[PDB]
């Protein structure tokens, strides 16, 4: 849904504290402002991006104190008050599974992880107690067996199936939730997409930092070493070569980051619409909310992403 809101500081990166380097960089007029504006735009759209995915709901709903949903067990998916941070056990599994400054800086996300968990809990409690009504308008209470009868009637199976196999279906749903928890706990590459996003961003930052050590054809890769031991008339050309190299590197970093931000924006627009058509309501869109005839969905926050439990 998002990635780290890095904001590389243009002048502090391309040049050190040296004033000569900044004076030379001033000749390259607005490359530097373009790069800074592009990175701030990326960060702003990541904030808007998480807000669009998760803030699908207006009221923060809370589940009733007593969990009597006709046999359906949501304990593995609703927040656990015992834990300090109000996260579901599956959310805890996801957060555990998913795992200095040269001018760089990472801006904190606008919505903290606790607030995102509060949004997901609101969506989940609204789903459990109301259905699609809480997204189609005001929230309307409905017993959960009645809501599943609604969903079965949605997939073309008459209600008598649910009201006559309620115990069996409740046990199957509970066992399926448990198996999801176990598979997430066991398989280490389950969180592949989020882990890959984080790793790609970290690799991009590390390559950007490593680019400082490159000589780029100059005598040395240290501005102080260039200023000392060399007088200004060719110190200018050495610094200019180094500036060209470092600015090319920063342009490459921001262009790759713009590509990846567009990719994440597409993925998170898909996440937002998947939220809207799967958890905010039942989807007849084939093979969109999980393989099979779709019944429900449950958002679960994950670090820089979202995880859905497509009950099919």
Chain residues 140-199 in contact with another protein, contact rule CB under 8 A? 140-143, 145-146, 149-150, 158-160, 163-164, 166
Structure tokens at 149: 């009868």
Mark out the alpha helices in the chain (DSSP H runs).
10-14, 19-25, 31-54, 89-97, 113-130, 133-136, 144-154, 159-164, 166-186, 192-210, 223-227, 232-274
Nearer to another protein, 128 or 190 (CB): 128
Interface with another protein (CB under 8 A), residue from 2, 6, 130, 297: 130
Residue 104's closest CA among 223, 221, 6? 6
Minimum Å gap between C-beta 41 and another protein is 9
Q: Output the six-digit token pair for 8.
A: 């590389």
* 85 makes contact with another protein (CB under 8 A): no
Burial grade of 14 (CB within 10 A; 0-12, 13-18, 19 or more): buried
User: How many residues make up the chain in this entry?
Assistant: 312
For another protein, the closer CB: 189 or 233: 233
223 to 262, contacts with another protein by CB under 8 A? 240, 251, 255, 258-259, 262
Q: Which of 19, 23, 40, 58 binds another protein (CB under 8 A)?
A: 58
| Two tokens, residue 299 | 């958002």
Q: Give yes or no for residue 217 binding another protein (CB under 8 A).
A: no
Count of residues in contact with another protein, rule CB under 8 A: 77
Which residues in the 15-54 window bind another protein by CB under 8 A?
24, 27-31, 33-34, 38, 47
Among 46, 56, 201, 249, binds another protein (CB under 8 A): 56
104 touching another protein, by CB under 8 A:
no
132 binds another protein, rule: CB under 8 A: yes
Residue 185: CB minimum distance to another protein, A: 29
| C-beta neighbour count of 241 within 10 angstroms | 16
Sign (positive or negative) of CA dihedral 220, 221, 227, 229:
negative
List phi, psi (to 5°) of 18: -65, 135
- Exactly one of 63, 120, 238, 301 binds another protein (CB under 8 A); that residue is 63
Please, which residue, 6 or 63, has the CB nearer to another protein?
63
Single out the residue of 19, 23, 60, 178 in contact with another protein (rule: CB under 8 A).
60
Least Å from the CB of residue 120 to another protein: 11
Out of 3, 14, 57, 180, the only residue in the binding site for another protein (CB under 8 A) is: 57
Residue 190 or 242: the one with the smaller Cβ distance to another protein is: 242
- Which range binds another protein by CB under 8 A, 93-101, 139-147, 171-179, 202-210? 139-147
Q: Characterise 26 by phi-psi region: left (phi > 0), alpha (psi -120 to 50), beta (else).
A: alpha
Sign, CA dihedral 157-159-163-166, equals positive
In the complex, the smallest distance separating the C-beta of residue 13 from another protein, rounded to whole angstroms, is 17
Q: How far is the CB of 143 from another protein (least distance, A)?
A: 6
Shortest Å, Cβ 19 to another protein? 17
**How near is the Cβ of 139 to another protein at its closest, in Å?**
5
Give the pair of three-digit tokens for residue 226. Answer: 């260039």
Q: Note every long-range contact of 114-119, with CB atoms under 8 Å and residues 24 or more positions apart, other chains counting.
A: 114/85, 114/86, 116/50, 116/54, 116/301, 117/79, 117/85, 117/86, 117/87, 117/88, 117/91, 117/301, 118/60, 118/86, 119/54, 119/55, 119/57, 119/60, 119/301
Least spacing, CB of residue 187 vs another protein, in Å: 31
């Amino acid at each position: 849904v998002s990635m780290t809101k890095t904001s590389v500081d243009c002048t502090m990166y391309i040049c050190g504290d040296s004033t000569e380097c900044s004076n030379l960089l001033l000749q390259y007029g607005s490359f530097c402002t373009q790069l800074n504006r592009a990175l701030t735009g990326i960060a702003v759209e990541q904030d808007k991006n998480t807000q669009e995915v998760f803030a699908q709901v207006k009221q923060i709903y809370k589940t009733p104190p007593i969990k009597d949903f006709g046999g359906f067990n949501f304990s593995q998916i609703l927040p656990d008050p015992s834990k300090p941070s109000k996260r579901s056990p599956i959310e805890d599994l996801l957060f555990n599974k998913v795992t200095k400054f040269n001018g760089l800086t990472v801006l904190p996300p606008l919505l903290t992880d606790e607030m995102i968990a509060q949004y997901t809990s609101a969506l989940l409690a609204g789903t459990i107690t109301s259905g699609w009504t809480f997204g189609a308008g005001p929230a309307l209470q409905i017993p959960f067996p009645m809501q599943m009868a609604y969903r079965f009637n949605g997939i073309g199976v008459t209600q008598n199936v649910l009201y006559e196999n309620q115990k069996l279906i409740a046990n199957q749903f509970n066992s399926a939730i448990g198996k999801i928890q176990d598979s997430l706990s066991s398989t280490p590459s389950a969180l592949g997409k989020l882990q890959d996003v984080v790793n790609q961003n970290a690799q991009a930052l590390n390559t950007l930092v490593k680019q400082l050590s490159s000589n780029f054809g100059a005598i040395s890769s240290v501005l102080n070493d260039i200023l000392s031991r060399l007088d200004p008339p060719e110190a200018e050309v050495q610094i200019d070569r180094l500036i060209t190299g470092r600015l090319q590197s920063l342009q490459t970093y921001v262009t790759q980051q713009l590509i990846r931000a567009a990719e994440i924006r597409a993925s998170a627009n898909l996440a937002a619409t998947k939220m809207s058509e799967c958890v905010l309501g039942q989807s007849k869109r084939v093979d969109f909310c999980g393989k099979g005839y779709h019944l429900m969905s449950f958002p679960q926050s994950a670090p820089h992403g979202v995880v859905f439990l497509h009950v099919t």
